[PDB]
Structure formats: C-alpha cells, structure tokens
Design a binder for this molecule. Sequence first.
Ligand SMILES: *[C@@H]1O[C@H](CO)[C@@H](O)[C@H](O)[C@H]1NC(C)=O
Ligand SMILES: *[C@@H]1O[C@H](CO)[C@@H](O)[C@H](O)[C@H]1NC(C)=O
Ligand SMILES: *[C@@H]1O[C@H](CO)[C@@H](O)[C@H](O)[C@H]1NC(C)=O
Ligand SMILES: *[C@@H]1O[C@H](CO)[C@@H](O)[C@H](O)[C@H]1NC(C)=O
Ligand SMILES: *[C@@H]1O[C@H](CO)[C@@H](O)[C@H](O)[C@H]1NC(C)=O
Ligand SMILES: *[C@@H]1O[C@H](CO)[C@@H](O)[C@H](O)[C@H]1NC(C)=O
Ligand SMILES: *[C@@H]1O[C@H](CO)[C@@H](O)[C@H](O)[C@H]1NC(C)=O
Ligand SMILES: [Zn+2]
Lengths: 622, 588
Amino acid sequence: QCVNLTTRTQLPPAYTNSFTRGVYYPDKVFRSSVLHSTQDLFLPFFSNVTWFHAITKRFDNPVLPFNDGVYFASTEKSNIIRGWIFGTTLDSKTQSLLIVNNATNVVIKVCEFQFCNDPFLGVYHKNNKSWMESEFRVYSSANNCTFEYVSQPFLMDLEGKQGNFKNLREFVFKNIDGYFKIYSKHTPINLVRDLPQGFSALEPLVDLPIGINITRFQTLLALHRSYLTPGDSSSGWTAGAAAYYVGYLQPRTFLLKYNENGTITDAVDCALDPLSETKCTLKSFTVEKGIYQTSNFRVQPTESIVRFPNITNLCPFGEVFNATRFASVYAWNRKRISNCVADYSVLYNSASFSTFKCYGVSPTKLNDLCFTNVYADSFVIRGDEVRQIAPGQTGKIADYNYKLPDDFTGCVIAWNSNNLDSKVGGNYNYLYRLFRKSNLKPFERDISTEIYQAGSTPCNGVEGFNCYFPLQSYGFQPTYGVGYQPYRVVVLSFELLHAPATVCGPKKSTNLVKNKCVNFNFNGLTGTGVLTESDAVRDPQTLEILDITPCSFGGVSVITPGTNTSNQVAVLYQDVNCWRVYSTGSNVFQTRAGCLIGAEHVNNSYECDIPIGAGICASYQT
Amino acid sequence: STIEEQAKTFLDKFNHEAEDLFYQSSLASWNYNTNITEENVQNMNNAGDKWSAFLKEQSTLAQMYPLQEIQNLTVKLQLQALQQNGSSVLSEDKSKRLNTILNTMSTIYSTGKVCCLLLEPGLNEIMANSLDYNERLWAWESWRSEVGKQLRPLYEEYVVLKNEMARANHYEDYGDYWRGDYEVNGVDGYDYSRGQLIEDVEHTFEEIKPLYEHLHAYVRAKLMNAYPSYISPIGCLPAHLLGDMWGRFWTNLYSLTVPFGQKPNIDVTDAMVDQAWDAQRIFKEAEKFFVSVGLPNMTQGFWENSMLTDPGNVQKAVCHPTAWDLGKGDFRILMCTKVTMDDFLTAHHEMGHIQYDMAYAAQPFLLRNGANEGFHEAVGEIMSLSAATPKHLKSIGLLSPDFQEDNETEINFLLKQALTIVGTLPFTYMLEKWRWMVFKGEIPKDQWMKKWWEMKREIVGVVEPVPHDETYCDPASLFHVSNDYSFIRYYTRTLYQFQFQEALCQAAKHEGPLHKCDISNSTEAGQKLFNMLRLGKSEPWTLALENVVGAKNMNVRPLLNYFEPLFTWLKDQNKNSFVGWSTDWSPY
Ligand SMILES: *[C@@H]1O[C@H](CO)[C@@H](O)[C@H](O)[C@H]1NC(C)=O
Ligand SMILES: *[C@@H]1O[C@H](CO)[C@@H](O)[C@H](O)[C@H]1NC(C)=O
Ligand SMILES: *[C@@H]1O[C@H](CO)[C@@H](O)[C@H](O)[C@H]1NC(C)=O
Ligand SMILES: *[C@@H]1O[C@H](CO)[C@@H](O)[C@H](O)[C@H]1NC(C)=O
Ligand SMILES: *[C@@H]1O[C@H](CO)[C@@H](O)[C@H](O)[C@H]1NC(C)=O
Ligand SMILES: *[C@@H]1O[C@H](CO)[C@@H](O)[C@H](O)[C@H]1NC(C)=O
Ligand SMILES: *[C@@H]1O[C@H](CO)[C@@H](O)[C@H](O)[C@H]1NC(C)=O
Ligand SMILES: [Zn+2]
C-alpha cells in the first residue's frame, strides 16, 4: 500500500562545499603518466552542494530536478539509502525508472509505476535479535514494463550501527542519448561530518539503455520498526542516522593527471581561475614566472549546432557506376552533379573496388562536408596504366588521353571489368590516342582524327611513310594477363565556389539560437561564439546574415612569480581605466598599460624583473 | 624531323599490332596443338600467312631508314634485327627451287624405310637394344644406303644455293651467316668478332681432351667383354656399337658399363605412387622451389589455361612438352604428366623456361629473347640440375627421412651423367667443323666422305664398320643436317650451364663437391640471377655473362671441376690399361 509519513520535523535546507570530488573516468582508454585536457560534464570544484540528513526524525526525501546528471555522495553506517526513482511525472502516466536494492537483490525496472505519495522500505523483533525487510511502499502498480533487470541474490545485514559513518558511496548519474550512465565508487571513511578532503577517481558502473525522459528524481530510504516504535504505520518508526550530498554537473573543461599505474590522481578545473586557465593552456602543473594572456575572461560554451542546406534528394551515383557501357579513354565521359546529398561511406566501403585513392582530402572527413559541384569522369583503360591516373604522373595516357592537374582535390576509383567488356576475338571498340603533335593541358578533351605526320612532306589525307592513323585500338580477351585486362576508371572532382553549396553530406540541421556561446557549424565551416542578428555567416535556411562575436572579451593579462615560488598572481586589464573584473580586490593601480590588481606599487625604482609595459616593472618580494 | 625521331615513331607503331598479330597466330597454334583437326589447321595456316606477310611488309618499309643516323644503341638493335632482307635476295625461281628442295628433304627424311621397318617405330629400338653385331650393322648400312645415297645431289644443290644467297647477303659464307649470331659491335671492352668464334672453341675442346680420352679408353676396355672378336685393344670404336643411330649420346651404353652395379640407382617412382601424387603436386613443388629461391609467383591464368595431363581418348593432341609464351601476359605449359622422376625433372625444366619468359616481358617486342641461342636451355637446365640432388629430395617427404649416401652411388651417378654430358661435345664439334668447312668450300665435292671419315677417326675416335664411296652422304642422315638447323648451340649450352652453376654455388655459400650443391633458400643467388634474367636481348651477351660469372668469355674449367672425382677414379682405373686410339686400325 501507500501511507503518508507524519511526525517529521521540518528544517531549512543545508549547503556545503564540494572539495575536489566527483571525478570520474571520461572514457575507457588506458592512459599512464600523462596530462589530458578534456571537456565534458563535471561538477565544478568547490561548488555549493546540498546536504540532507537522517537522524527530530528529519526523514528527508524530496523530489529534485534531474537537469544534466546528478553527483550523489552518501555517508552511511547501516545502508539506510535503498535506491532511487527517476522520471518526469512519476504518476504512472510517464515511463519511470526504479533502481532499488532490497535485502535480496538489486532490481532495475523501467515501468509506468503508480508511485506512492511517500514511498519507503519499513524493515525488528525484541524476542529474537534479527532485522528483516517487512514494508515496501513504493508504487501502487506497474502496467507497462520495457526494461527489467534483477541482480544475483545476496543477504543484507540490515543491522543498525551505533558508530560513526563508515561507508562513503559516490555516484554519478547521466542521461545521454537515452543511455543512463552510472559511475560508482565506495570508500571506507572515519569521520563525524563534513565532506572529507583528498582525491578519488570514480569508475564506471553501468550503462543502461533505457531511452526514457528523466526530469525529476527521488531517493528511497529504509525504515526500522520494532517494539520501541509504537503507533500506526505513519508514526511507529524510526529513521536511522545517515547523510547525503547532492550536486549538479556542468559542461566544463578539466585537466586530468594519470600516474604510472594508469589511474587518475589529480584534477585541475580549466575555466576556474586565470592561474588555472594558464595551467590548462600550458598543459602542465607548474607555471614559471612571467606574463600570460590565454584567451579572455573564462567561459565554457553551452551547446553546439549544425546548419546545413536542406536537399533531401538522393544523389544519383548508381547511374554512373552501374552503367551499361563506358566511353573510350580518348573521348572520356563527363557528368556534372549538384543539388544532391551523397553518402560517401557506402561508396568507400562497397568492398568491390581495386583502387580507391583520395588526393588532398581525407577519405572519411569528406563525408560531412559541403561542395558546390561534383564532376564524374568515366572511361576504361588497361591495368598497367591505371597508376598513370595521378597528379604528376607521366606516360602515354597522362600525355595524350587524360591529363590531371597537379593541385588535384578529388578521388580516383578503379575496378576490374574482365567479365563485362571482354570477348573472344577482340573487343575492338576502345581506342586511344598514340601520336599527338603536342601535350595536353589539364582537363582537356580531343577527338580530332587527323592523320599524324612525322616527316617533312605533308600527306594529303593519305596514310603511308611518316603518316599514321592517330588512334590505336585496344584488344580485349578473357585470356589476357592481369596487366592487360580492362579496368573501369571513375574520377570524382570536387568544385568549391563562393556560391551557396549544392552538395552536402548527410547530417542534421539543429534549431539555431542567438545570444548564446555556441559551437556552430555552417555549411561545413565551424566556429564558436555568440550569434548576433544583423566574421559574418549567411545561414542556408533563411539567408539572414549573423555576426560572430567572440563571447567573452577584454584582453586579460596574468603576472606570476612561478608555481614553485608562490600562488600569488597579479591580474591586469589592458582596456580598463581605474568594471568587468573577476574581483576588485586591492592593490588597484592604474598605468598606461591598464589596471593592475594584486601587485603593490612602490615609490622606488629597481631593476626590471617582470616587464609589463610603458616602463612598468614588477617583482615578487616579502 | 631527325631520323632518330622517325625511327622511334615507326617502332612505336610497329610494336602495337605486332603484339596483336603474334598473339593471334600463337593462339591459333595452341588451339591446333591442343585440339587437332582440319579446321584448326586452316586457321593456323591463315594466321601464319598473315603474320609472315605483315613481317615482310614491315621489313620492306623499314629498309628505307639508314642505320648510320641512329645513335641510341637500342633502336639500332631493333632495326638491325628488322632490316633482314634474307631469302628475298634470291630469285623467285631460285626461291621456289630452294623451297622445293627443303620440302623434298623433309619428306624423304620423314618417309624412310629399309624393309615396313620405319625409323621411329623400331629402328631406334633396334639400335638401342639389338645387342647383335650383325643386326645392328645391317640396320646401319641399310639406313645409310636408303638415305645418304639418295640425298647427295639434293644436298649439293642446297649447298650451292645457300652459299650463293649468303654471299649475296654481304656475308663471306653461310657458316659466317650462322656465326653472325655470336656478334656484338659498338661496345668497348665487350665487342666480339665472327672470326673469333671459330677459335675459342677448339681451345676448350683441347682442354677437355684428356678427360674424353680416359673415358673413351675406359669404355673400350669395359666393352671388350661383349663382342670379343670385334673389339681391338687399340683403335677406334666401331660406329654402329654406340647404342645410337649416330652415336650422338651414350646413355644406352650405361646398362653395359657400370662401376658398382650392386648399388641401386636413385628412384622415387615407388614413393610417388605411395604418396599418390595427382599430376598437379609436381607443379606445386616446382612453384614452391622457384618461390623459395626468390623468384616471383605463377600467374592465375597459368593454372587454368594450361593443360597438364592427357585430355583423354575423346580428344587427341600431340603433347611433346613445351613452354608457351603467347604474349600479352599469357603463359602456358603443354605436357602429358605422368608419375615419374623424369617427369618431375622435365616439369622443373619447363617451369624454368616459363620463369625466364616472365623475367624480360617488360622489354619491347624485338628484344624478347635470350641473350643468344645458348642461354635459354642452360637457364632451363640448371634448375633441373639443382633439383636432382639427393639432398633436395630428402628435404621433400618423398625420400627416406633416414638415408645414407655412399661414394659408390655418387660414382655411378656421375658416370651416368657424364656418359651424356661429355659424350656429345666431340661429336658436336666435329660435325659443326665439317659443315663449316663444307660451306667454306675448302673440301672438294669429291672428298666429302673421305674428309668426314678422317675427321671421325681423328677427332671423335670412332671408325666405320665398312668403307663407303663418294656416292654415300652419311652426315645428311641427321635430322638437323637435312633440315637447315644450326647445331653449335648444343656445344656452348653445357659450358654456359656449368659456369652458371658454379657461380650460383659460390654465391650461395656452399661447401663440398659441386655435384652436391643446391641453391634453394638462397635469396642472394636469386637476386643475382634475376639481375641477368631481366636484361633480355637489350644488352650484349658478354655483359650479361659478366653479371653472373664475372668473366667476359666462357670457361670450361667448371666442367672439369664438376667431374674431377670421376676424373681421378678413371685415372686410377686406367693406370694399367692403355690410353689412346689407333688411327690406322680398321674393322676390315
Ligand atoms: C550497383 O549495383 C550493385 C550490384 O547489386 C549494387 O550493390 C549497388 O548498390 C549499385 N549501386 C552502386 C552505386 O554501386
Ligand atoms: C575441338 O574441336 C572440335 C571441332 O568441332 C570441337 O567439337 C571440340 O569441342 C573441340 N574440343 C575442345 C575445344 O576441347
Ligand atoms: C634511347 O632512347 C630511350 C627512349 O625510350 C631512352 O630511354 C634511352 O636512355 C636512350 N639511350 C641512349 C643511349 O640514347
Ligand atoms: C635487301 O634489299 C635492300 C633494298 O635494295 C638492299 O639494300 C639490301 O642490300 C638487300 N639485302 C641483301 C642484298 O642482303
Ligand atoms: C605469392 O607468393 C607468396 C610467397 O609465399 C605466397 O604467399 C602467395 O600466396 C603467392 N600469391 C599468389 C597469387 O600466387
Ligand atoms: C669410396 O668407395 C670405395 C669402394 O670400396 C671405398 O673403399 C672407399 O673407402 C670410399 N672412399 C674413398 C675416399 O675412396
Ligand atoms: C628451406 O626453408 C624451408 C623453410 O622452413 C625449409 O622447410 C626447407 O627445408 C629449406 N630447404 C633447404 C634446402 O634449406
Ligand atoms: Zn627446354
């Protein structure tokens, strides 16, 4: 059933500080003795997290939002916490996830639970000293169930302890792409209260493919009932001392340190303080004395968007590749394609091509790009001369049939065709130029059939001495060697112009936003900053010019005497006349270079240790 | 423009469609050989006529270009091989008469009886196994009377016609025309002269003279057991008692003369049968050996186009083993494979020929041949020599894993091999010298038989059983003599093959006697061999020879080193018997 717990004293919420906790492994790649800078959802250091107690009763279990993942620390001595519930409404109207740990198993279910108003687990007898699970008031019913998992059976102690908290359980919950990622860690502790200091790397625990909408969540605790708790179900119970800290993760950049054992030992917040930003930029834990300007005031952009022209037309590659016949090399087939979306991955991985070489462009990176035009040039050649279709190559084909420019920017595909256009007796339909007066300019076609003259005397359209037919004929048979079998060659050339792109890779166009620090991708070119309605980009969906403001601004300088010397630093604002500052502090001195904070100005004039500008020199003293 | 540019353009035009016509003719010939029928005969004849007409037209057109202007030294070779007026010099009636003479010679050699009692089905069997003095003498005399007596005036007219043609071709004699093959010009330190070829042959022949003398004396001594009333203690051996119609080879004599007959010879027929080789494992082993040396693979088309067994009783086809280079990257092998050691060795030989053909395919059409006429068979034969060693057989599972070798078996094997390798050198030299002298005109038309038999008694050391007059023409009974075939190749082939074997054994870091040498698993030897194989005819043969052995000219010393233990054994055995022959002695 469900009962509303009463006789509970209400107290104002308490808050504490997160002393360098909530550090988990970003991935599953082994790194040893290395400093890795990576941006992801982490709890900022020394943040203000919320503290809840269980001891006045104070049986606190409110419903809290699940914004971007929750960091949950728990100080326990008797395993009062029993599990959690996540969802959107938690009233059986929306799909809800219950992760509970009873005295027997661990049950993870994703169902439309009709959750009780005050869910709890009221587990004792005087005559025999034994604690057993007795009450489970979580949900009225579950109608539709999608995911269900039960852990192996185990026996829980369920026994209360009169000592201090001995277990510290740290969990990180994230909901990314319908996947609930849980990172877990346990630590033996001996303390009275407050968050312990130190460092701890959180290891991944589970990645459940639930695929549900999670907005709110609640923690499920345990109750103890015996002869010492008289009354009804709503009053005849105790709480049991426990505590837990709750915090929210934010998208931040962190510098992680890996020791010789491959474990995480230290973490640095990158957009926390100017000293931290300098440490992150230098990718080291020690910074020498000097002046540094990393980027600007600290800021981590919120999201990322992509804006690509909308052309849902499947691009016709099957027309060219799967063609009945191909033209001769001396008269090679040209086709132009535009206003289409091309899936280059299937073409690259069709696993039926003898040669596939892309010049100037990475074979995989070209998938998500935008191009103005594409040219497909097709013909049939001999196996030996396929290598001649490449920039800077020389030969008969490269000088009389098909010339390729040195600064090529496309791809070349070629595959064997000995089963299609090879017949006994000789397929005398394919020709090729063998004698030409001059060379060929890049991307040139000639079909002239004038007889070539090599001698002094001109022959009047008649063959003979020093006069030959210009075009020779290939012969093809099913019994030639590999070097003489026919090969079908298709060259793709990508043309880029300032005109709006017509060919683009298969991607999404996410709704655009304004006045937000975002990582935008327009027509294949990426950038970061704030988009302002009006360097400037013309979006392909409404043809509206948007200006790119570099988010934070104001050239900020930092003076340090060395990490080993001291942590005291001086902050200089070069465009502020003494405003937009991290903190006004003290030692505010205005010079031609700007406003300096944290450095003492003296009436003397010593040798220049740390130059700043306009004849100003500073140093660190007692 | 310049003559060189025009010549290059003409050659570029020629090679295209030269390859095409050659491929079509070769395909027709292969179809006829694999599938014998009248229609295939007509196709082959038409293709051959077309190819010949195209060659004549191209030669006529190329005659215009003067050779003096070309200075590229590669176009000049192709033009010189192309500017071959040749038989077109003779008059049309003269050409018809010459063709009729040659056709009549071929027909009369093919159609010969002494009965009934044809040459191939029974005459060779008698000459190899009769064992009767009277029967062998009768067959020899009957064949001589039936062939040489008839072929005298035809051969005389042929000689005068061919000598006239050679003289009209700006050549001193037809012998000079043949010897023009061993000629290289324009290279300092490598050039050769036609007159140098007549010398440098007798020198090495005299170098091996004591070995041949010892072998001949030993053979005479051993043969005295049979025909006691016909063998002289000193003198020349009777002509008909050589186990051959002409005595070119002494292999059949091996049965009579053995030093240690108790020791069995090496044979793997039983092992092949027990392991049940399916007439394809042989080629697999050959390919594996050639790969292990370091040479490339075998093309996929070779494994399906070529036929390596009898087609069956349904379809007939002559299957004298052959290695076919059809052009345009097509390679085939024609054999009737059976489970014998001889088939194993001949398969290795043909695979070697195929590898040699693969090596130089990148060269233009006019230069796709061996360095000279003697390189190709030597290259094909050194592979069989290397693969015939007992060590190589023991490496394969066919031979016994635990086998012991004794020097008696080594001596038996060396004697059997020497009965063929060295028994033909004096005969080849004598026959080619006689033909050269006949062509030169030194010998009068009434002294042919006398001079021929004098040379046979002196050089070869073999005497005729009965005298013959000037009516007879004994040397015309040979296949090569009557069919206009140059014959010096069978002399230099052995020299080249033994020089190559010595060079490879030295470069492969092997120790011991030369006859116990194998070159498998020797990448350096393979690379050195390829550095010569890939040359083709582009470079002078002297330079190609230097690229392996390191000597500009051929040396007979490696051959002597090969048979040195047998030389010592023969000297020890002949320390008591006489050495030499008596010229004056005759059977009658
Ligand atoms: C061409 O035909 C093949 C054969 O089925 C097919 O797999 C392929 O999708 C077709 N189109 C292209 C562009 O290759
Ligand atoms: C050989 O040629 C005849 C001619 O008709 C043909 O019937 C036969 O199939 C051919 N044998 C082959 C190609 O193996
Ligand atoms: C001859 O011409 C060819 C052109 O194919 C060239 O490669 C070669 O170096 C030339 N040799 C000489 C000696 O001129
Ligand atoms: C072949 O004919 C040509 C053309 O007259 C001639 O120059 C050449 O000497 C002839 N060859 C001979 C006579 O060997
Ligand atoms: C080519 O030779 C190598 C050498 O061992 C062998 O592994 C490979 O299978 C051969 N390939 C073909 C196609 O013969
Ligand atoms: C060679 O064979 C003979 C045959 O009896 C034998 O006596 C001799 O020891 C063997 N070895 C040598 C080196 O002669
Ligand atoms: C060559 O090497 C192969 C590789 O194991 C070996 O099986 C074979 O016995 C070797 N042959 C010789 C003659 O060394
Ligand atoms: Zn051969």
